[PDB]
């Protein structure tokens, strides 16, 4: 297996569920991945469950934090070469309605999943562009950037945003040659250690009139899609939207 | 002509252009109306040109000036009754791609065309939820919360971030029986000052490849589907887009 | 003060329902108009219970009968002059899933639904071309243009085709400078006698996680984004998707 | 290593361009295919160019005809095992304007592009249900499924028709436990010996305003994103549509 062959990865919020499993199967297919995250304790630990440093290292770092951007990929480059690749995953959500959100909560979560995916796109775009790599930025943008749900305001706001962002970015890239492409990927609910906690939640997300097939996804189910927009095969598509949802959209 | 019988309307950025006309209609259907801008003179003209103010005021506002909002709307019900309908229309756009954003340009943009229209989307909730009013607030939100532009990645970001916040807000009054609906408007190219101004930004966006209809609107195309928004004939439309573009995004 | 001054419409399925309305408030703002039906009783009732023969007449015609086409608008333009507006509105629905479609339901629905639309835009087209008309065609598309049902099959096929082949349509007319418009409507669950017939389909339809305004819509609700597309309010919307649906889609 | 362990496929229009590169990959990735084409010599010679009648076999077949696709899913079966997978493919395209499009180039497109893919899509939820092979049925259905082109009136109905069916029988699948998966694949332009054959086609394509990236794809482009819709890599995605077109309909 060796599907991203000499690809180089930055996985951000790649100590958990989604982020985690990207960076499982990319080492898996033969790529090198930093992943970040704000505790290294848990971070250390998840970087050896999937390999040596040779293949697979942590960085703490908050996707907020547009300083530490920079750092995050002179590390990743110190450790593995050029950077091919970022997945932008760190975000977090907050349950409350429109009506309902503070401004602290509003501005702290699009700290995070707005302007943190700006911020990877941005020096991913300046970092990696002319340099033959076929690089390729995959934005997290979830089903909460295609449909609205009345308890995720916030969330539905930041992940529009990161979904017509994204497009932008791609245009730029394919209009001035700069072998990156830019693509969003739009989870449904997936079992995550997150969604574990919160009792009732996989319960309420696996409705049939949420999701059509009846239960959640797992993380894996997220990689595998991550994988193909990594890789060389999926040379031709970029500005597009990759949703894996068990059937939620579709109706 | 009353369409609008009996409602009163805020619309922001409302002193020049596409919201100069939506006030202009506004009033012309029976409507009254509050409009903001940042320039008391060009304000206080603008007003005075469509009417008295027995149906449209002024009021000196910056649509990012969070304290500003609750005022706005303590003033226009002294001056008209129970507001009815909030139109968020105050933006700006910023010509740069995603990787030349600066962070200031980025944060600067958002604070008027997100933060703004969060601003005004969630105070429109709390003061016209439950009053019988047939409520509705009429988000700005433009072609551009459908397709990229490689110029245009903050704006992209914000009108996408509108777009999907917009339907989180409509179901949330709508399973709360609110009497609230929330729409979005997207307007392609525009003929306005600001394009005016730009030497070459008319002759570029009457390109057919981009507008197929070969020439750019004008801002009372805008206000006439605004009328229909905010009028009780669009009573079972809520969480929807609609999208006024000379054919812009039609290919 | 007519919105529809000197407009001259055909409406297909006008005798009862959304279309009926549709003729209804046509008539309203000054627009003369030709309802079709396949019963001539129900249809000169219907005509006349609106207005005068000098305003709105039944023609009985199916509309997958293309040579009737052509009758349909030589009698339209012979009681009132050239046709300016098409609102293609006939239509049938199968409670299939695809797996048990037979192929005589997938043809007979197809014929109407399919080729019933495209005979009235293309001899709309050619029809009210270059005559500075301020012509409108409003092909009716459904939420089943836009989401699937799995008891829809076949009416999800006829509406997706629809929803695209207008756009096609909207846009050879732009680049030609033709003086048409075409556009789509797309109605959620509406209030009509057929409904009121199937015990239980309004409350079914009226459940949250159907409809989220908790009630369905009316023919008007139809009707009034109908009038906005005809009328010359709308002279810059073409190619573009007009959904009256209660937030069904938003979610 | 091989990602379609055990699969058995369909593969209809498989002899040429998109659909003999989906044949080609689905081969090299563990699964028997058959292919299918109008053409005997054709067909036959483009089978053995991929591999052994082991794992590919041509039939001759026309996807219009329905009678020959329970043949054709029998001779599958009797050479290979239960279909696992089905592609429909074969598609025709016709350079009209809806305005200019006959009646019976309507008829002869729909037949092939709209009632083929019904047809396979009927009989693979049929033969496939409840038999826990991981089935999968993707149905191609172009840029044309999004957005309209003034001279692809047919194409474009055919197109936007099979995008929505598609999204129906995808949820009926997942409602029912179906084991059986319902996905659309959009290619935008790719080079085929066919696209060789117009000339100037490519050079058309190729325009930024056209395509961003500036040139056109691929078959193989096509090939690996029907991989891992056929893979049970994506057993969470159902109901969605997987865009790969360099960009076109980003903008
Ligand atoms: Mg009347
Ligand atoms: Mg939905
Ligand atoms: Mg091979
Ligand atoms: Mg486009």
């Given at each position: ?149 009345p308890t995720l305001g916030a969330y539905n706001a930041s992940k529009g945003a990161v979904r017509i962002m994204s497009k932008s970015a791609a245009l730029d890239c394919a209009l001035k040659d700069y072998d990156v492409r830019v693509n969003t990927v739009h989870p449904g609910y997936i079992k995550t250690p997150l969604v574990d906690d919160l009792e009732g939640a996989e319960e309420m997300m696996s409705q049939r009139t949420k999701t059509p097939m009846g239960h ?36």
């Open positions: 297996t060796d599907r991203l062959k000499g690809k180089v990865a930055i996985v951000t919020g790649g100590t958990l569920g989604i982020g985690l499993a990207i960076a499982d199967k990319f080492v898996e297919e033969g790529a090198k991945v930093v992943i970040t995250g704000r505790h290294a304790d848990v971070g250390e630990k998840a970087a050896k469950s999937i390999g040596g440093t040779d293949v697979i290292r942590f960085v703490q770092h908050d996707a907020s934090d547009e300083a530490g951007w920079t750092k995050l990929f002179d590390t990743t480059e110190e450790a593995f070469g050029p950077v091919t690749t970022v997945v932008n995953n760190a975000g977090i959500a907050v349950s409350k309605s429109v009506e309902d959100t503070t401004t602290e909560e509003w501005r702290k979560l699009l700290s995070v999943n707005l302007d943190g995916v700006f911020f990877g796109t941005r020096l991913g775009i300046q970092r990696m562009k002319n340099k033959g790599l076929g690089a390729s930025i995959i934005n997290m943008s979830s089903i909460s950037g295609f449909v609205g749900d959640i996804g797992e993380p894996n189910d997220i990689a595998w899609i991550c994988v193909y927009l990594a890789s060389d095969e999926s040379k031709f598509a970029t500005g597009a939207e990759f949703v894996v949802d068990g059937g939620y959209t579709a109706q």
